[model samples]
Target: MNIFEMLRIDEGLRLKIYKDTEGYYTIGIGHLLTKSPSLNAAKSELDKAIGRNCNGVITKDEAEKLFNQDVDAAVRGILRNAKLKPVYDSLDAVRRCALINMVFQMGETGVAGFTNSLRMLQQKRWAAAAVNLAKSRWYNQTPNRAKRVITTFRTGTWDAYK
Candidate 1:
């Protein structure tokens, strides 16, 4: 499955600023301002990108550009994270997508906290990894997306892409 395609499905596009499930100000394709250097800084960047004050709106092209940047950062962060790099290196493409999906939903720090699951994944204990993943609060927070990611981790298949 194309990573961007899966991400687009999971993170529906939005032209106006709104609060995400976690209440963070978000725009474009799940770009959380809180995740940026600073909320105001993020807004400024968005404002610059869209060539407007971005009080509440952004264009599709600008949104797509931000999404690309966000996804690439998540991928790089995963590969650079000490706890996840080895785990990431051992996974197949499908399984890798599952990790990237997790990173996209939550930041790398949040995903890194899944120590047990990451360890299980690194050991190729797919079933155990999925079980560990389901044990988290994240599972309850976004049951649908979490379930797909867990299934992908368990079966090494493109669950989210579907």
Candidate 2:
């Protein structure tokens, strides 16, 4: 549907702060640390904002706001990525959809992590970029999701989910 909705499907939602699969402290919907705040610092933030610890409970409204904020920030990060923005705009909408979702999951740095792949995409080398995308830690870390995007980028077919 939308970027936030897609993120909801991809990252799932959590109210309480938890360590992600990669062992990073995450909260709300799949928001990761852009800043490496110490546990106490995070708690301090919460303490200031809501007068509680980092582990303090949040309302559903708070969670939804946080999720939307995270998604909005990620999307802005993607657009600001000099390596990714042009490529994304150049790609067809279907693959653009995939790229947007990739940035949502991986963030600007993660999408830009594929320098080789984005370079290929920059040159309009679809298959080469797709190949490069598959050969990264991103793919290795999560093959199914990566491959799903890789296939769409490589083949321009958004039918992988079907």
Candidate 3:
């Protein structure tokens, strides 16, 4: 099956996808999706968090806000009670989405809290970032959740919805 089919996200849901905190939407098994205030607003905040169009710097407060917003949206989305909008945008790929999902669960402060790891990811040092991802107090805290997402981030392949 194609990736979207494998993920079980129909065209309708896929079209309305938004980035999780990590600049991707990688919601894992058992995650409760929730509603978001506005897709445009969330994406704009996320861009600020990732410094997408900015000067490549995100304050601690900005990161925290963006992270919180993502988690709220995810909780709403997974719960199957998300609000509908005609226009919504998402990351390019499921892998990217998954990465952001993990970040959302962990919190931007919690995820980017890894100062060294953030630096590594920013530098595109994949190996180091992976290692840093593992070396967290948060890591393996929730074994089921950690194992699934960690595997996805490492291998770049994971079941989208489950």
| Top lDDT hit | 1
What is the Cα-based TM-score of model 1?
A: 0.89
Ranking by lDDT: 1, 2, 3
Model 3 C-alpha lDDT versus the unseen true structure: 0.44
Report lDDT (CA) for all predictions. 0.84, 0.71, 0.44
Prediction 1 global C-alpha lDDT? 0.84
Give the deviation of candidate 2 from the true structure as CA RMSD.
3.0
Count of backbone collisions within predicted model 3: 17
Candidates' TM-scores? Answer: 0.89, 0.78, 0.39
How well does model 2 score by local distance difference test?
Answer: 0.71
Cα lDDT of model 1 by residue, 42-69, tens digit: 6776687667787768889889989998
Candidate 3 residue-wise lDDT, 1-162, digit = tens:
333233233211222234443344322221222345555554555454456653323454544444456556653453342211100122224445444555445534454355675455445465666777777665655555565555555555655335
Candidate 1, after superposition: displacement of residue 140 in Å?
Answer: 0.9
Name the weakest run of 10 consecutive residues (lDDT summed) in model 3: 81-90
- Best-to-worst order by TM-score is 1, 2, 3
